[PDB]
């Protein structure tokens, strides 16, 4: 079990850790989150009580260092930092626990939700999408734009997702124009899986990370990226059987976890209706289809 | 963006542009089989690619052999159209390649876009106009060359004959669309109007009769009257 301590909570803010969240009052004595399960990535995110715009937060993995949170009154936001002094960091964590000023990561033992949402997400890949190599954790917020969005302005603050574009030379072999546009198998399997992602686990990891950023920060370009990578599989006639089955589990837990009241912006009607009912893979997403119908029959 | 009544004069500026109409690309007859089922038989078709400023028409004849052994032929027809249009652009010198291609049916955007990926500066546009280019096979010389073809063939025509020696592009296109609109609404009457006077002939190198300026006025009025009559009949107005 690991701990992310907080120096203080000067401003009233809603704090999330993974899918859990707590309200903290201006200068309430809040001093960290303990019992954080080792072995998965995690995200700690913020929304100030005074600006319900700009949700923001930090992806991290506690195996990679000792990390803590501190409010910066100049830049006006809670900042993640690394403590390199191991002894000085256990000292702070132990004193805060003794005083019991830390919330416990509230995992129910029956629950694999977080594992299922993050199964393929690896901190090393996150830090290639969010390039900022002097920190071991990654900052993301509501307003960050993607590389593909920029092309159609500040690159230091860009989400470097893999660019997918169904009407590009990358996607379409000369002479197979109609074949490749109607059946994206060559783009999925040769260009993206074998070529760029190397394997399906890295592909699924970016997909899951894109979804989580859309859900937790309302990041619009992440939502676009998640839908694109879904559509690319569903629009391919030839997909490894192991990918289809894992995909149905991945999407199931994503749909299960979404806030009911956000289904309007986060879910793209055309993509899902095409994936579930028109695509090559209509018959291959039985659990995802069943949850979608029983929870959002309107969108369909 | 889309072409409409507002931006209609753009068709006659000096930016090269082509209209593409795919309506006559895949043509069938429907008939009963011996066992009483329905079957189709394909006949020859054409792509109608037209420069509205100059009148130049690139009639690409689509021979029934294209379809042999293929499924989902109405979808394939769109990709074959786009394939052939792209090949036409590639065949033209750089300074003759269009800056825009306007498709008369929206289902053509994605096939042409994909076939034109090598030409990112050629803009593919839909249109909101209801252009009558499907009646191209009502023009006797075009129908004749399509139906006689024994292999894929491109035939070039000027669809304005020599009108541009005496009128502007704008007026020429308006005459062409009025003539085709009438042929579309009532082919038999439209054709009667054009040929009634046997002393007005069609030159061997032309598609339409050699009307004088005043005779064109009488013709155009007769085609307007045809079109309005058929409307009242269609709707009981």
**Which residues in A lie closer than 8 A to residue B79 (C-beta atoms)?**
177-178
Q: Which residues of B touch A (CB under 8 A)?
A: 76, 79, 82-83, 110-111, 113-115, 117-118
3-state secondary structure (DSSP) of residue B20 = strand
The token pair that represents B182 in the structure block = 């009438």
Residue A181 contacts B where some CB pair is shorter than 8 Å: yes
User: What is the C-alpha separation between B49 and B38, in angstroms, rounded?
Assistant: 33
The Cα of B4 is separated from the nearest Cα of chain A by a number of Å equal to: 26
Residues B154 and B193 in one domain: no
Measured distance CA(A112)–CA(B26) in Å, rounded: 55
Indicate the residue among B122, B148, B163 that finishes a domain: B163
From the list B28, B46, B125, B50, the residue with the least C-alpha distance to B84 is B46
Same domain for B85 and B176: no
First and final C-alpha spacing in chain A: 42
Last residue within a domain, chosen from B163, B192, B220: B163
Q: How many CB atoms lie within 10 A of CB A300?
A: 13
- B5-11's contacts with Cβ under 8 Å and 24+ in sequence apart are B5/B128, B5/B129, B8/B129, B9/B170, B11/B52, B11/B53, B11/B169, B11/B170, B11/B173
Burial (Cβ within 10 Å: 0-12, 13-18, ≥19) of residue A26:
exposed
Distance from the first to the final alpha carbon of chain B: 35
Which residues in chain A are immediately followed by a break of C to N over 2.5 Å?
Answer: 152
CB B114 to CB A172 under 8 A?
yes
Q: Is B191 in a helix, a strand, or coil?
A: helix
How many Cα atoms occupy the beta-carbon half-sphere of B59 within 13 Å?
25
Which residues of chain A are within 8 Å of residue B117 when distances are taken between CB atoms? 167-169, 172
- Whether A177 sits inside 8 A of B115 (CB atoms) is yes
Residue B221 resides in a domain: yes
Task: Note whether B198 and B214 are same-domain residues.
Answer: yes
Q: Chain B residue closest to A165 (CA)? A: B114
Query: Could you tell me which chain A residue has the CA closest to the CA of B78?
Result: A178
Confirm or reject contact between A179 and chain B (CB < 8 A): no
A167 interfaces chain B, CB cutoff of 8 Å: yes
Query: Nearest CA to B105 among B17, B46, B7, B19?
Result: B19
Tell if the CB–CB gap between A181 and B114 is shorter than 8 Å: yes
Residues B177 and B107 in one domain: no
DSSP labels for chain A?
-EEEEBS---S-EEEEETTEEEEE-TT----EEEEEPTTS-EEEEEEETT-SS--EEEEE-GGG-EEEEEEETTTTEEEEEEE--HHHHHHHHHHHHHTT--EEP---TT--HHHHHHTT--HHHHHHHS--TT-SSEEEETT--BHHHHH---GGG-B-PPP--TTSTTT--TT-HHHHHH-THHIIIIIIIIIIISSHHHHHHHHHHHHHHHHHH--HHHHHHHHHHHHHHHT-S---HHHHHHHHHHHHHHHHHS-GGGHHHHS-HHHHHIIIIISTTGGG-HHHHHHHHHH-TTT-
Q: Is the dihedral of CA B68, B69, B75, B80 positive or negative?
A: negative
CB pairs under 8 A between A and B: 22
B25 CB contacts (<8 Å, ≥6 apart)? B45, B46, B47, B62, B77, B78, B80, B81
User: Virtual CA dihedral for B229, B231, B236, B237, nearest 10 degrees?
Assistant: -80
Residue pair A161/A147 in contact by the 8 Å Cβ criterion: yes
Tokens 């009532």 correspond to: B186
Residue-number span of the structural domain to which B147 is assigned: 9-163
For residues B27 and B41, give the distance between their C-alpha atoms in angstroms, rounded to a whole number. Answer: 8
Do the strands A77-83 and A66-72 form a parallel or antiparallel pair, or are they unpaired?
antiparallel
Cα separation, B67 vs B77, whole angstroms: 9
The domain boundary, picked from B137, B163, B189, lies at B163
Residues 6+ apart with CB under 8 A from B175: B160, B163, B167, B216, B220
Cβ of residue A165 closer than 8 Å to a chain B Cβ: no
Domain identity same for B185 and B132 = no
Measure Cα distances from A206 to A146, A161, A183, A280 in Å. 13, 8, 22, 23
Kindly state the helix (H) or strand (E) to which residue B29 belongs, with its residue range.
strand B27-32
Could B82 and A181 be called an inter-chain contact, meaning their C-beta atoms sit closer than 8 Å? no
CB-closest option in A167, A168, A178 to B79: A178
Say if residues A57 and A217 touch (Cβ distance below 8 Å). Answer: yes
Do B75 and B178 lie in one domain? The reply is no
Q: Which residues of B touch A181 (CB under 8 A)?
A: 110-111, 114
Structure tokens at B171: 């007026």
- Residue B128, domain CATH: 3.30.420.230
Q: Inspect the interface and report whether the beta carbons of B113 and A178 lie closer than 8 Å.
A: no
Contact across the interface for B114 and A177, Cβ inside 8 Å: yes
Say if CB A5 and CB A90 are below 8 A apart.
Answer: no
User: Residue B106 falls within a domain, yes or no?
Assistant: yes
Alpha helices in chain B (DSSP H): 73-91, 109-115, 140-148, 169-185, 187-195, 213-235
**Min CA distance, B8 vs chain A (Å)?**
28
Residue B236's CATH number: 1.20.80.40
How determined?
X-ray
Q: For chain B, what is the domain count?
A: 2
In this structure, are residues B30 and B40 in contact, taking their beta carbons and an 8 Å threshold?
yes
Q: What is the stated resolution of the deposited model, in angstroms? A: 1.8
Dist. CA B185–CA B188, nearest whole Å: 9
Q: How far apart are CA A176 and CA B36, in angstroms?
A: 38
In three-state secondary structure terms, B123 is: strand
Residues 6 or more apart whose Cβ sits within 8 Å of residue A28: A9
Contact status, residue A49 vs residue A55, Cβ threshold 8 Å: no
Name all domains of chain A by residue range, CATH numbers in brackets: 1-143 (2.60.34.20), 144-300 (1.25.40.550)
């Amino acid at each position: 079990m690991n701990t992310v301590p907080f120096t203080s909570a000067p401003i009233e803010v809603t704090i999330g850790i993974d899918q859990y969240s707590f309200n903290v009052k201006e200068n309430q004595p809040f001093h960290g989150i303990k019992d954080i399960p080792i072995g998965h990535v995690h995200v700690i995110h913020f929304q100030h009580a005074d600006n319900s715009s700009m949700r923001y937060g930090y992806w991290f993995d506690c195996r990679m260092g000792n990390f803590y949170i501190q409010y910066d009154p100049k830049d006006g936001l809670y900042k993640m930092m690394e403590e390199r002094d191991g002894a000085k960091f256990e000292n702070i964590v132990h004193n805060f626990k003794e005083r019991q000023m830390m919330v416990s990561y509230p995992k129910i033992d029956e629950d694999d939700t977080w594992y299922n949402l993050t199964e393929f997400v690896q901190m090393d890949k996150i830090r290639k999408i969010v390039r900022k190599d002097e920190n071991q954790f990654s900052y993301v917020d509501s307003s960050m734009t993607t590389v593909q969005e920029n092309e159609l302005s500040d690159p230091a603050h860009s989400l470097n997702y893999t660019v997918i574009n169904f009407k590009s030379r990358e996607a379409i072999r000369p002479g197979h124009e109609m074949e490749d546009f109607l059946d994206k198998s060559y783009y999925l399997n040769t260009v993206m899986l074998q070529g760029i992602f190397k394997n399906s686990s890295n592909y699924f990891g970016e997909l899951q990370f894109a979804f989580l950023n859309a859900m937790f920060f309302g990041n619009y370009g992440s939502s676009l990226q998640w839908h694109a990578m879904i559509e690319l599989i569903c629009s391919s006639a030839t997909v490894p059987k192991h990918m289809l089955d894992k995909l149905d589990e991945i999407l199931y837990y994503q749909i299960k976890t979404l806030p009911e009241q956000y289904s309007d912006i986060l879910l793209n009607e055309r993509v899902w209706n095409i994936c579930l009912y028109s695509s090559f893979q209509k018959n291959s997403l039985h659990n995802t289809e069943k949850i979608m119908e029983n929870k959002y029959p309107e969108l369909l | 963006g889309a072409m409409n009544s507002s931006n209609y004069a753009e068709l006659f500026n000096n930016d090269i542009k082509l209209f593409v109409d795919d309506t006559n690309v895949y043509r069938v007859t429907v008939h009963k089989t011996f066992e009483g089922n329905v079957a189709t038989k394909a006949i020859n078709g054409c792509i109608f690619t037209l420069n509205p400023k100059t009148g130049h028409l690139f009639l690409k004849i689509i021979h029934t052999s294209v379809w042999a052994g293929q499924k989902r032929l109405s979808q394939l027809a769109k990709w074959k159209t786009a394939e052939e249009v792209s090949a036409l652009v590639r065949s033209l010198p750089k300074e003759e390649q269009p800056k825009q291609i306007i498709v008369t049916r929206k289902a053509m955007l994605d096939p042409l876009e994909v076939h034109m990926l090598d030409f990112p500066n050629i803009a593919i546009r839909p249109t909101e106009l209801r252009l009558p280019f499907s009646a191209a096979m009502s023009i006797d010389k075009l129908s004749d060359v399509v139906m006689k073809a024994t292999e894929p063939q491109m035939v070039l025509f000027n669809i304005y004959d020599d009108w541009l020696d005496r009128i502007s592009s704008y007026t020429a296109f308006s005459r062409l669309t009025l003539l085709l609109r009438a042929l579309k609404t009532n082919e038999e009457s439209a054709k009667m109007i054009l040929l009634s006077d046997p002393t007005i002939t069609i030159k061997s190198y032309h598609l339409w009769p050699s009307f004088t300026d005043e005779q064109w006025i009488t013709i155009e009025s007769q085609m307007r009257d045809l079109i309005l009559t058929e409307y009242g009949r269609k709707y009981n107005v």
